[PDB]
Design a protein around this nucleic acid. Structure first.
Ligand SMILES: [K+]
Ligand SMILES: [K+]
Ligand SMILES: [K+]
Ligand SMILES: [K+]
Ligand SMILES: [K+]
Ligand SMILES: [K+]
Ligand SMILES: [Mg+2]
Ligand SMILES: [Mg+2]
Ligand SMILES: [Mg+2]
Ligand SMILES: [Mg+2]
Ligand SMILES: [Mg+2]
Ligand SMILES: [Mg+2]
Ligand SMILES: [Mg+2]
Ligand SMILES: [Zn+2]
Lengths: 108, 86, 53, 154, 50, 143
RNA sequence: GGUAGUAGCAAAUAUUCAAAUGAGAACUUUGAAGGCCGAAGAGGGGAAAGGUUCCAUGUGAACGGCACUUGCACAUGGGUU
RNA sequence: GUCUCCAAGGUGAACAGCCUCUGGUCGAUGGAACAAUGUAGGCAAGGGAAGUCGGCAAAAUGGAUCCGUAACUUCGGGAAA
RNA sequence: AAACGACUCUCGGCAACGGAUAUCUCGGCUCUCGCAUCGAUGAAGAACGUAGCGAAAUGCGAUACUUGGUGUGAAUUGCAGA
């Protein structure tokens, strides 16, 4: 199915004691695995803006918590091995912040 | 330092190509060839190197003129004449 | 397609470093068609090749 | 060409082979040993899993210093096994060629199984390395010949 | 070097001309034994030693 | 020491020409079966019987055996429990077997009647300074 | 041959995301981001030495100690006023 | 290993170290884990050379300003005592 | 229950690796015979060029894998053209 949801991902605990030079790339891999588990799609694409946000503070200072939007969409290409894929983009942080914020269904 | 480090300094040619024998054996500072002793009039050759003599002896080259001598001898060096007209 | 030649020629024509040349990622096919400095100048005039600040 | 083993009934069999394939002889031997007598479809699925790192090729003869894994437990009790992707890719290509030959022959692929499969050493190719104290050592490859035959069960 | 004598340059030109594969039609000649150019040279493998 | 210093220098003499079983060697450490003797029972907490709580005669504060924030890596103790002097084998949550003594306990230490005066229940996930959550809340003005 | 698919591939801070091509992309190209060289440089030229390695197009095999769609490799052309 | 020309901003005495601009570049086969033993780099309560052939290694000191500076001396120094 | 399998070893068929063996040879080695002919009228050697399509070998010298005379008498040949 085609479903869009917004998640809060606790990268701080997933990257605990990660070697500095591999922290941000490990963060990208961590987000990819999170998307795979949440949507069940092996093929996950990370938006350039989200990649910028992860790397915005260097290779060490990955944000502790990141709000992302994950959309499972049908892959139109016929040669593609997988029928569905997941797109991970940045999500807007409410004024109150991330405190009290759970998982939301975005699709109208 | 006498090994690999020392080999890093090789950019001055002791020898260049020889005018006479064409080998890279012309000692620039001595101004003489270690292979043929150019510019000495006589060629440098020694009996203690039979291989060196056979590398450069007569017949190893072209023999532009010499190769034709036996043919002229067989005719007794006939000159100034032609075959009878057809 | 590779645009290495176009990048080098644009760097030369713009009189800037190769790291300050911007080749439009959406105009790859038409940029690749240019093989002479005249074509590079035409592309620069058209705005497909820009010197970055 | 004459294969090492000829089928009992050639009319109901197909063959494929490769010569001087640029793959390690020992890994190829291990995977071929793993594949013998298996049905064609099961062999294809097994090799695909090996490429996906879901099933392992048990390393049995050329196993000195090989790591151990739980994946090869059912085939090799000691657990020694690996996932040589190059050898399985070449053997899968040869199996596809054999299947195409069977299709041309008119055989039905459902009951096909690997009657025979063998890996032989091909001619070694030469490169070299540089060792301490100004020495040079051989740096060789070990290509292999691969042949297989598919037969109709029963 | 950029500075080179005329004679050395001519010798280098001859060496460049001699560095090519044999014509294909040589292999079709009756009673041919030449398989390739056995005297091929690469600037990084064997130096001319001039 | 060339080639490292965390070693046994000489692992044996020339003769016998074999390494013996008595020489220290690197190998598995921990996860060994052990039997520890003479661990005195200081209290037997019975669930819902007023002996489960950590209240003593001297200290009348109403509190449970479980420390502030729970037992680290274990949880909340609610069933019967034994408070034993000293330490016992294994990490937290490890199942341990309790064995009746095989010896005759006649020593003065074994016969001693211990009377608990104070049982600490402060948080063990740090330098706990409060005994109860209510005490901390009163201290910080939130109660 | 055994050794053995073993010893090893570890200095010079570091890569990541999307797209294009391709049978095949961690390694090719484009864009974005995050880093390094930090002007007695990992920048820009010469002397010696090398001799076509220079530039364009294309690429079976070998080589580029993993890989390559790639290239100081290979093949065909051009270039030093 | 191999001669030489050009040489920005900040800090700072300083073509010291550290960061940055132009220019260049991420080229050192990649992935997972974080056992022993290693290599390189730190810390460690109390004691302070008891270690060792031997203070080996490490630690301690360190810039600038002010005060002050012994024996000895070839009268110059010692002295940054 | 040490059976089936794996490993090692062993024997046989087949397939590999390698190039021994046998059969060859426009080459070598040895003996014998005939002749006497390099060069300032520029030798030997050395360099560079030269073919429709050649790098090497062979040949040749801007008349450049050949010009001319004579002999022989229908080719050269890998391809194309004359
Ligand atoms: K192993
Ligand atoms: K390609
Ligand atoms: K001491
Ligand atoms: K002593
Ligand atoms: K056999
Ligand atoms: K003639
Ligand atoms: Mg002179
Ligand atoms: Mg080496
Ligand atoms: Mg604690
Ligand atoms: Mg300077
Ligand atoms: Mg080039
Ligand atoms: Mg200043
Ligand atoms: Mg023979
Ligand atoms: Zn000479």
């Amino acid at each position: 199915e085609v479903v869009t949801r917004e998640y809060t991902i606790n990268l701080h605990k997933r990257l605990h004691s990660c070697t500095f030079k591999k922290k941000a790339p490990t963060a990208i891999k961590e987000i990819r695995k999170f998307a795979q588990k949440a949507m069940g799609t092996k093929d996950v694409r990370v938006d350039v803006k989200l990649n910028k946000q992860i790397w915005s503070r260097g290779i060490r200072s990955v944000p502790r918590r990141v709000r992302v939007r994950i959309a499972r969409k049908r892959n139109d290409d016929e040669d593609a091995k997988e029928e569905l894929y997941s797109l991970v983009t940045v999500a807007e942080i409410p004024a109150e912040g991330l405190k009290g914020l759970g998982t939301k269904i975005i699709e109208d | 330092g006498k090994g690999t480090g020392s080999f890093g300094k090789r950019r001055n040619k002791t020898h260049t190509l020889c005018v006479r024998c064409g080998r890279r054996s012309f000692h620039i500072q001595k101004s003489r060839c270690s292979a043929c002793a150019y510019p000495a009039a006589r060629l440098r050759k020694y009996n203690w190197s039979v291989k060196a003599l056979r590398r450069k002896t007569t017949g190893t080259g072209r023999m532009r003129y010499l190769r034709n001598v036996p043919r002229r001898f067989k005719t007794n060096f006939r000159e100034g004449t032609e075959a009878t007209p057809r | 397609v590779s645009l290495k030649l176009q990048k080098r020629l644009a760097a030369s024509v713009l009189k800037c470093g190769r790291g300050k040349v911007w080749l439009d990622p959406n105009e790859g096919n038409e940029i690749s068609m240019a093989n002479s400095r005249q074509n590079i100048r035409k592309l620069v005039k058209d705005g497909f090749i820009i010197r970055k600040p | 060409v004459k294969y090492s083993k000829e089928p009992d009934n050639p009319t109901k069999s197909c063959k494929a082979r490769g010569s001087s394939l640029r793959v390690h002889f020992k890994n190829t031997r291990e995977t071929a040993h793993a594949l013998r007598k298996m049905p064609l479809d099961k062999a294809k699925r097994y090799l695909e899993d090996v490429l996906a790192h879901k099933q392992a090729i048990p390393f049995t003869r050329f196993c000195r210093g090989v790591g151990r894994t739980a994946q090869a437990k059912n085939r090799h009790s000691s657990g020694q096994g690996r996932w040589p992707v190059k050898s399985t890719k070449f053997i899968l290509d040869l199996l596809k060629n054999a299947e195409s030959n069977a299709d041309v022959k008119g055989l039905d692929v459902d009951l096909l199984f690997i009657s025979h499969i063998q890996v032989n050493q091909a001619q070694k190719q030469r490169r070299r390395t540089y060792r301490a104290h100004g020495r040079i050592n051989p740096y060789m490859s070990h290509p292999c010949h691969i042949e297989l035959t598919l037969s109709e069960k029963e | 070097p950029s500075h080179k004598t005329f004679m050395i340059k001519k010798k280098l030109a001859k060496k460049q001309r001699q560095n090519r594969p044999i014509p294909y039609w040589i292999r079709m000649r009756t009673d041919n034994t030449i398989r390739y150019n056995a005297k091929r040279r690469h600037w990084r493998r064997t130096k001319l030693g001039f | 020491t060339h080639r490292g210093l965390r070693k046994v220098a000489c692992i044996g003499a020339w003769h016998p020409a074999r390494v013996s079983y008595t020489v220290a060697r690197a190998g598995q450490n921990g996860y060994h079966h052990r039997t520890e003797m003479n661990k005195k029972v200081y209290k037997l907490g019975k669930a819902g019987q007023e002996s489960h709580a950590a209240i003593t005669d001297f200290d009348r504060t109403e509190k449970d055996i479980t420390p502030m924030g729970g037992f680290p890596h274990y949880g909340v103790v609610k069933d019967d429990y034994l408070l034993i002097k000293g330490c016992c084998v294994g990490p937290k949550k490890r199942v341990v077997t309790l064995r009746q003594s095989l010896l005759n306990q006649t020593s003065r230490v074994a016969l001693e009647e211990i009377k608990l005066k104070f049982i600490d229940t402060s948080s063990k996930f740090g330098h706990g300074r409060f005994q109860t959550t209510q005490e901390k809340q009163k201290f910080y003005g939130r109660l």
